[model samples]
Target: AIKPDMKIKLRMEGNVNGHHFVIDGDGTGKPFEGKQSMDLEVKEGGPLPFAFDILTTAFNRVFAKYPDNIQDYFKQSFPKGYSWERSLTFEDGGICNARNDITMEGDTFYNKVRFYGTNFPANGPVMQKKTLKWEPSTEKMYVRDGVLTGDVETALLLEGNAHYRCDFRTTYKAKEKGVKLPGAHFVDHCIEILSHDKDYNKVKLYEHAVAHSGL
Candidate 1:
């Protein structure tokens, strides 16, 4: 298993079954306020064989503007000149949900979030995974992905087909782009930065099973 506590930088790759699923199915998505939403239960697959929610709990009560969905999900408010590391969460079909946070532990970068789940409400069952950029960004999401080999996987799907890369565009900044990892496998192990912005990162999640480590 990859070390979780210690900070490490690694390259990532994956098959984008996502793009294919969207365009090939009965698309048209959902009725959302700002950005837009689409259910993963159908297009992608399901109750995620193994999933977790990256908890990005907000220090402030600010709410997400675009990916706004059916919850009281909050937005992060950073101090002047400081890109406050935020809290994020996701349920990748795992038994529990993960709460994620991106903050600096000294000069080292770390995502401090917890993993677990409880039966709650509507806004409770699932959380929004928004790509707050714009339309073409398409803000993708899913809920019912399954683990192919029987073992619980992390934020990535191995049973699915293969594509070019898993990294989301691979161009961003944590200062401007933030991210919320959705699988337990990636918590303490390795992953690829499909995209990043120090402020906000869009990673194409990968489970350790696909490749020993990064590509």
Candidate 2:
């Protein structure tokens, strides 16, 4: 039911704001605002293999404590203008650094994340960088039957013209009875991801359950 080592490769050929772009297995193309084209590849171990676990843990820990309301949960868990940074040393000699910055306005949470290091998962060991901006709306979230659920349509933009629009969804439930801890006491939770274009076109990139509690 859950396969973390799944592999994928995609070629996105389209235009962004009148600028032409092409991103495929061969690694080519530039963004409208950038000068060089960075290599974009979906490696054998899936996307963000190491970082995904950290993100889910961080999110679930905060979410389980306040599973009743999504808005109030984020507001209390991550205050306005919150920033966190960490360095991860992989067994393969890949020293990656992740930086996360977050801000909130009304019912919207704006998050900016950057991952850069040697031998990165997707881009290999040339010292590559990737940035992700997540805009999730608390107004679009709701809790029912002891489960909190929400969805967000966002894009992962590459340097300049290359980008991938994705739909992200999460379903989290807190433990009914058990020891209460930040990272512990979760019944069931999962994060899912799917790919689509901004023009509502059905683009088959790769779809999978990125993270689950059983993992």
List RMSD in Å for every model shown.
19.7, 17.0
Q: Give the number of the best model, judged by TM-score.
A: 2
TM-scores for the candidates? 0.20, 0.30
Can you tell me which runs of candidate 1 are displaced by over 4 Å? 1-96, 117-215
lDDT of 2 by residue, 1-215 (tens): 11112122233332211223333332111111111111243322222222222122111112222333213332244333344444544333444354445443443333344444444345522223333322221212445444454444444344456543434444433223321213322233233223323321222221111112223
The global C-alpha lDDT for each of the candidates, from Candidate 1 onward, is 0.22, 0.31
The clash numbers for all candidates, in the given order, read: 54, 5
Q: Write the per-residue lDDT of candidate 1 for residues 114-189, one digit (tens) a residue.
A: 3333332233223322222111112222222421111222233222332111112111112323323222111112
Error of 2 at 128 (Å): 14
Cα-based lDDT at residue 144, candidate 1 = 24
- Compared with the true structure, model 1 gives a TM-score of 0.20
Best lDDT goes to which candidate? 2
